Design a protein around this ligand. Sequence first.
Ligand SMILES: [Zn+2]
Ligand SMILES: [Zn+2]
Lengths: 124, 124
Amino acid sequence: ATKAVCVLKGDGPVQGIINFEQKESNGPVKVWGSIKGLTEGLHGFRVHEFGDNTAGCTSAGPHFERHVGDLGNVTADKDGVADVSIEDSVISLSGDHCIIGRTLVVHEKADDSRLACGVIGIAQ
Amino acid sequence: ATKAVCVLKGDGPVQGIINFEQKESNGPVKVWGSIKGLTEGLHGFRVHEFGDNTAGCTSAGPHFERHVGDLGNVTADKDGVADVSIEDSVISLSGDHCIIGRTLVVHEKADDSRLACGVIGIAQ
Ligand SMILES: [Zn+2]
Ligand SMILES: [Zn+2]
């Protein structure tokens, strides 16, 4: 399990696709993609505990203060677009800190209300 | 991972929520829920390899004759509703036969077009 993908959707205009790649167990996770429809500026970007979208982003639960799921912020430009490119060694695509089957969420405000989310699935 | 859930959606009216529960990692998986918007009769019900819905159900790829993700059929009644209740000892919510982060699909034809799908996520 070295690749994953998430389709972000919400009740507003936020939309995006986020890819994850992890070539080696324990090794870093590359996280990259693009999100549009945001207000200009910083937005919280987190993996939440449950891949449960039966009630939208609300059923995703709490963060998977500092949590393993706190990826930090994405940045939207004046056009409302955030190009994402992160390396993170705290999340994983295997083992205990595995984020597969969990939910990725983009928040209304900056890290240090849930605008869009999707369940993180295994990719080819 | 002892519980999972999947929200099924497509381009047409097929929609529903499927729950999974596995008390013990060796034991069977209970699968239950409801899907509406189906033509009366049998429809193929399968877990496909990738939890990738960037291109709708198409990107979910192949079945995860007999494959591990081949759950059988669901039956829609005369109102187009399939009430699902099954116990499956082939799939799992952990291990090599894990379906978390893969895609559940309901099909136009019976197992003997992908009408809706969703990525299977960890549930509380
Ligand atoms: Zn946190
Ligand atoms: Zn098959």
